[PDB]
Design a protein around this ligand. Structure first.
Ligand SMILES: CN1CN([C@@H]2O[C@H](COP(=O)(O)OP(=O)(O)OP(=O)(O)O)[C@@H](O)[C@H]2O)c2nc(N)[nH]c(=O)c21
Length: 162
Protein backbone atom coordinates (compact mmCIF):
# COMPACT_ATOMS: atom_id res chain seq x y z
CA UNK A 1 0.00 0.00 0.00
CA UNK A 2 0.97 3.63 -0.61
CA UNK A 3 -0.63 7.04 -0.03
CA UNK A 4 -1.54 9.73 -2.57
CA UNK A 5 -3.84 12.74 -2.27
CA UNK A 6 -4.97 11.67 1.19
CA UNK A 7 -6.06 8.27 -0.10
CA UNK A 8 -4.56 4.93 0.84
CA UNK A 9 -4.13 2.99 -2.40
CA UNK A 10 -3.96 -0.78 -2.44
CA UNK A 11 -3.45 -2.67 -5.68
CA UNK A 12 -5.89 -5.57 -5.95
CA UNK A 13 -4.94 -6.93 -9.40
CA UNK A 14 -2.57 -6.47 -12.33
CA UNK A 15 0.96 -5.12 -12.70
CA UNK A 16 2.82 -2.43 -14.63
CA UNK A 17 6.17 -1.83 -16.33
CA UNK A 18 7.62 1.65 -15.88
CA UNK A 19 8.99 4.26 -18.26
CA UNK A 20 10.03 7.89 -18.04
CA UNK A 21 8.18 10.40 -20.18
CA UNK A 22 8.38 14.15 -20.54
CA UNK A 23 5.01 15.82 -20.98
CA UNK A 24 4.38 19.44 -21.91
CA UNK A 25 1.58 21.45 -20.32
CA UNK A 26 -0.38 24.12 -22.15
CA UNK A 27 1.71 26.71 -20.35
CA UNK A 28 4.68 25.08 -22.08
CA UNK A 29 6.03 23.72 -18.81
CA UNK A 30 7.90 20.43 -19.15
CA UNK A 31 7.02 17.75 -16.56
CA UNK A 32 9.04 14.58 -16.11
CA UNK A 33 6.61 11.81 -15.16
CA UNK A 34 6.96 8.10 -14.46
CA UNK A 35 4.34 6.16 -16.45
CA UNK A 36 3.04 2.84 -15.15
CA UNK A 37 2.12 0.81 -18.24
CA UNK A 38 -0.39 -1.99 -17.84
CA UNK A 39 -3.80 -2.90 -16.47
CA UNK A 40 -4.08 -2.41 -12.71
CA UNK A 41 -6.95 -2.24 -10.21
CA UNK A 42 -6.79 -0.29 -6.93
CA UNK A 43 -8.99 0.39 -3.94
CA UNK A 44 -8.67 3.94 -2.58
CA UNK A 45 -9.55 4.72 1.02
CA UNK A 46 -9.91 8.25 2.31
CA UNK A 47 -11.36 9.93 5.38
CA UNK A 48 -14.76 10.60 3.82
CA UNK A 49 -14.69 8.68 0.55
CA UNK A 50 -13.64 5.35 -0.92
CA UNK A 51 -13.13 4.34 -4.54
CA UNK A 52 -12.23 1.45 -6.79
CA UNK A 53 -10.10 2.33 -9.81
CA UNK A 54 -9.09 0.41 -12.92
CA UNK A 55 -6.44 2.00 -15.10
CA UNK A 56 -4.14 1.13 -17.98
CA UNK A 57 -1.41 3.08 -19.73
CA UNK A 58 -2.19 6.77 -19.11
CA UNK A 59 -5.86 5.82 -19.26
CA UNK A 60 -8.56 5.69 -16.62
CA UNK A 61 -10.75 2.70 -17.48
CA UNK A 62 -13.32 2.70 -14.67
CA UNK A 63 -13.80 4.58 -11.40
CA UNK A 64 -16.51 3.91 -8.81
CA UNK A 65 -16.65 6.23 -5.80
CA UNK A 66 -18.68 6.44 -2.61
CA UNK A 67 -18.56 9.42 -0.20
CA UNK A 68 -20.53 11.33 2.46
CA UNK A 69 -20.98 14.46 0.40
CA UNK A 70 -20.33 16.22 -2.88
CA UNK A 71 -17.00 17.66 -1.71
CA UNK A 72 -15.40 14.39 -0.59
CA UNK A 73 -16.65 12.59 -3.70
CA UNK A 74 -15.13 15.32 -5.85
CA UNK A 75 -11.85 14.97 -3.96
CA UNK A 76 -11.67 11.25 -4.77
CA UNK A 77 -12.44 11.81 -8.45
CA UNK A 78 -9.70 14.47 -8.68
CA UNK A 79 -7.09 12.17 -7.12
CA UNK A 80 -8.03 9.30 -9.45
CA UNK A 81 -7.91 11.49 -12.55
CA UNK A 82 -4.47 12.85 -11.65
CA UNK A 83 -3.26 9.35 -10.73
CA UNK A 84 -4.39 8.14 -14.17
CA UNK A 85 -1.83 10.42 -15.84
CA UNK A 86 -4.32 10.93 -18.71
CA UNK A 87 -3.30 13.44 -21.36
CA UNK A 88 -6.56 15.36 -20.93
CA UNK A 89 -5.57 15.93 -17.30
CA UNK A 90 -2.11 17.22 -18.31
CA UNK A 91 -3.82 19.46 -20.86
CA UNK A 92 -6.19 20.79 -18.20
CA UNK A 93 -3.32 22.45 -16.30
CA UNK A 94 -3.47 26.27 -16.42
CA UNK A 95 -0.46 28.46 -15.54
CA UNK A 96 2.90 27.29 -14.11
CA UNK A 97 3.26 24.69 -11.36
CA UNK A 98 5.71 25.60 -8.60
CA UNK A 99 4.24 24.02 -5.47
CA UNK A 100 6.42 23.20 -2.42
CA UNK A 101 6.01 20.90 0.59
CA UNK A 102 5.94 21.77 4.28
CA UNK A 103 9.72 22.16 4.23
CA UNK A 104 9.53 24.48 1.22
CA UNK A 105 11.04 21.81 -1.07
CA UNK A 106 9.70 21.59 -4.65
CA UNK A 107 7.06 18.85 -5.05
CA UNK A 108 7.67 16.13 -7.64
CA UNK A 109 5.59 16.35 -10.82
CA UNK A 110 2.63 14.11 -9.80
CA UNK A 111 2.21 16.24 -6.67
CA UNK A 112 2.50 19.44 -8.72
CA UNK A 113 -0.47 18.18 -10.71
CA UNK A 114 -2.36 17.05 -7.60
CA UNK A 115 -1.93 20.42 -5.86
CA UNK A 116 -2.96 22.28 -8.97
CA UNK A 117 -6.24 20.42 -9.35
CA UNK A 118 -6.96 20.43 -5.62
CA UNK A 119 -7.06 24.23 -6.03
CA UNK A 120 -9.47 24.13 -8.96
CA UNK A 121 -10.85 21.13 -10.82
CA UNK A 122 -13.19 23.02 -13.16
CA UNK A 123 -10.97 22.72 -16.27
CA UNK A 124 -10.09 19.13 -15.34
CA UNK A 125 -13.71 17.98 -15.14
CA UNK A 126 -14.77 20.08 -18.12
CA UNK A 127 -12.08 18.65 -20.41
CA UNK A 128 -12.31 15.06 -19.13
CA UNK A 129 -15.36 14.08 -21.18
CA UNK A 130 -18.88 12.75 -20.65
CA UNK A 131 -20.68 9.61 -21.90
CA UNK A 132 -24.12 8.02 -21.84
CA UNK A 133 -24.53 5.46 -19.06
CA UNK A 134 -26.78 2.46 -18.53
CA UNK A 135 -29.35 2.28 -15.74
CA UNK A 136 -27.71 0.05 -13.14
CA UNK A 137 -29.25 -0.39 -9.67
CA UNK A 138 -27.17 1.11 -6.88
CA UNK A 139 -25.21 3.32 -9.25
CA UNK A 140 -25.58 6.88 -10.58
CA UNK A 141 -23.70 9.21 -12.94
CA UNK A 142 -22.11 12.53 -12.05
CA UNK A 143 -21.68 15.49 -14.43
CA UNK A 144 -18.69 17.88 -14.51
CA UNK A 145 -20.68 20.41 -12.46
CA UNK A 146 -21.23 17.70 -9.81
CA UNK A 147 -24.91 17.33 -10.71
CA UNK A 148 -26.13 13.73 -10.48
CA UNK A 149 -27.54 12.19 -13.65
CA UNK A 150 -29.25 8.87 -14.32
CA UNK A 151 -28.47 9.15 -18.04
CA UNK A 152 -24.92 10.51 -18.34
CA UNK A 153 -21.66 10.79 -16.40
CA UNK A 154 -18.05 11.87 -16.66
CA UNK A 155 -16.23 9.27 -18.75
CA UNK A 156 -15.51 6.11 -16.76
CA UNK A 157 -16.89 7.56 -13.53
CA UNK A 158 -19.83 6.17 -11.53
CA UNK A 159 -21.05 7.08 -8.03
CA UNK A 160 -22.17 4.24 -5.78
CA UNK A 161 -25.32 4.77 -3.72
CA UNK A 162 -24.05 2.18 -1.27
C1 LIG B 1 0.76 6.71 -11.28
N1 LIG B 1 1.36 5.80 -10.35
C2 LIG B 1 2.38 6.21 -9.16
N2 LIG B 1 2.64 4.91 -8.56
C3 LIG B 1 3.53 4.81 -7.46
O1 LIG B 1 4.68 3.90 -7.79
C4 LIG B 1 4.72 2.93 -6.64
C5 LIG B 1 5.00 1.57 -7.13
O2 LIG B 1 6.30 1.57 -7.68
P1 LIG B 1 7.08 0.21 -7.85
O3 LIG B 1 7.19 -0.46 -6.51
O4 LIG B 1 8.46 0.49 -8.41
O5 LIG B 1 6.27 -0.70 -8.88
P2 LIG B 1 5.55 -2.08 -8.56
O6 LIG B 1 4.39 -2.26 -9.51
O7 LIG B 1 5.02 -2.10 -7.16
O8 LIG B 1 6.59 -3.25 -8.77
P3 LIG B 1 6.39 -4.75 -8.29
O9 LIG B 1 4.92 -5.08 -8.24
O10 LIG B 1 7.06 -5.69 -9.26
O11 LIG B 1 6.97 -4.91 -6.92
C6 LIG B 1 3.42 3.01 -5.97
O12 LIG B 1 3.60 2.74 -4.54
C7 LIG B 1 2.95 4.36 -6.18
O13 LIG B 1 3.49 5.23 -5.14
C8 LIG B 1 2.01 3.97 -9.17
N3 LIG B 1 2.03 2.50 -8.85
C9 LIG B 1 1.31 1.64 -9.59
N4 LIG B 1 1.31 0.24 -9.32
N5 LIG B 1 0.54 2.10 -10.65
C10 LIG B 1 0.51 3.42 -10.95
O14 LIG B 1 -0.18 3.81 -11.89
C11 LIG B 1 1.32 4.37 -10.12
Amino acid sequence: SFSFGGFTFKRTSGSSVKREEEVLTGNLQTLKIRVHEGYEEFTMVGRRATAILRKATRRLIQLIVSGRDEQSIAEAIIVAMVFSQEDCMIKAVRGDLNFVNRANQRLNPMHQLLRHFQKDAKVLFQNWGVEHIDNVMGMIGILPDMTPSTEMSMRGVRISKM
